[PDB]
Amino acid sequence: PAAAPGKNFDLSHWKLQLPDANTTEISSANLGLGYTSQYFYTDTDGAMTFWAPTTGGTTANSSYPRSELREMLDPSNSKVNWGWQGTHTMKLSGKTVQLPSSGKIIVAQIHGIMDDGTNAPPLVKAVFQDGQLDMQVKQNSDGTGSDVHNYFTGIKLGDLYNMEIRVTDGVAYVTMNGDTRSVDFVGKDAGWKNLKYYFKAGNFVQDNTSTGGSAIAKLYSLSVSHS
Ligand SMILES: O=C(O)[C@H]1O[C@@H](O[C@H]2[C@H](O)[C@H](O)[C@H](O[C@H]3[C@H](O)[C@H](O)[C@H](O)O[C@H]3C(=O)O)O[C@@H]2C(=O)O)[C@@H](O)[C@@H](O)[C@@H]1O
C-alpha cells in the first residue's frame, strides 16, 4: 500500500513508455496522480521499479520492449527538447534486480531527436550486464559507424550504482560511482549539432525472445538539471 513512484520522485517532466501490447504511455500528470501497474511500481524498499517482459510491445523503431521514462521539457509537447550547447545533467542511483535471458538491459540514455519530433539515433546508452556497465556513446549522428564503449567492470546484479550522464557543449561525460569518462560527440560529427536530445531512464530490455523472461530495474533517486 506504499505510495506510487510519482509521489516519491519528481515526475512532472517525465512521461512513461510501457511494454504492453499497445505500448501505452502515461502522462506526467497521471504519474503525479499515482499511476502504478505491474510495469511500474514502488517496491518494499521504496524504489521506483520498472518491470518489462521480453514478449512486450515495442516502439516503432525498436525490436525491444521497455518500461522507461522519457524526459519531457514540456509535458504537453514531446517535440520540445534540448540542444548540444549549455549543460544538461541527469543523476540517478539504482540497481538491476533481474535480467532477461540475454543478460542485458539499458537503464539510462540520452536519445537524439529531430527538430520536428522524428526519431534520430540514441546518443548515450547505459548498458547493464551482471558484472559490467557499458556507457556507450554513439559516434555519428546519422547512425553510421559504431559506438564508443566506456566499460565499468565489477558492477553486479543487485549492486547499487550511482550514475551521472552530462552533456556540456557537445561533449558527453559518463560517470559511474565517481569514475567519469568523456566523449566529444560534436567533435566526431558536427551533424550532432543538427539534432536535439532528451534523457531516458528505466528498463529497456535487450531481449525480445518468447522464452527470454523479463527484467526488473530500480531507481532510488532521479534528477535532471539544465543550466
Ligand atoms: O535506445 C533506445 O531507446 C531505442 O529506442 C528507439 O527509439 C524510440 C525511443 O526510445 C522512444 O521510445 C520514442 O518515443 C516516440 C514514439 O513515437 C512513441 O510511440 C511516442 O509517440 O512518443 C515518441 C517520443 O516520445 O518521441 O520511440 C522511438 C522509436 O521510434 O522507436 C530506437 O532509436 C532504437 O534504435 C533505440 O535502440
For residues 175, 40, 44, 132, the Cα torsion angle rounded to the nearest 10 degrees is: -30
The residue with cell 547493464 is 128
8 A C-beta contact, residue 9 and residue 39? no
**Whole-angstrom Cα distance, residue 193 to residue 157?**
36
| Rg of the chain taking only CA atoms, in angstroms | 16
List, chain by chain if needed, residues with CB within 6 Å of any ligand 1 atom: 17, 23, 59-62, 70, 78, 109, 111, 119, 122, 125, 204
- Strands (E) across the chain are located at 14-17, 25-26, 40-42, 48-53, 66-71, 87-98, 105-113, 119-129, 132-138, 147-148, 151-153, 161-168, 171-176, 179-184, 196-205, 214-226
Cross-sheet strand order for the sheet of 179-184: 40-42, 48-53, 214-226, 87-98, 161-168, 171-176, 179-184
- Give residue 125's domain range: 1-227
Residues after which the chain is broken (C–N above 2.5 A) are: none
CATH code of the domain containing 23: 2.60.120.200
Residue nearest to ligand 1 atom 31, measured at CA: 61
Count the domains in the chain. Answer: 1
Residue nearest to ligand 1 atom 30, measured at CA: 61
Cα of 180 vs its chain's centroid, Å: 18
213 C-alpha to ligand 1 centroid (Å): 22
120 C-alpha to ligand 1 centroid (Å): 9
Report resolution (Å) to 1 decimal: 1.5
8 A C-beta contact, residue 40 and residue 49? yes
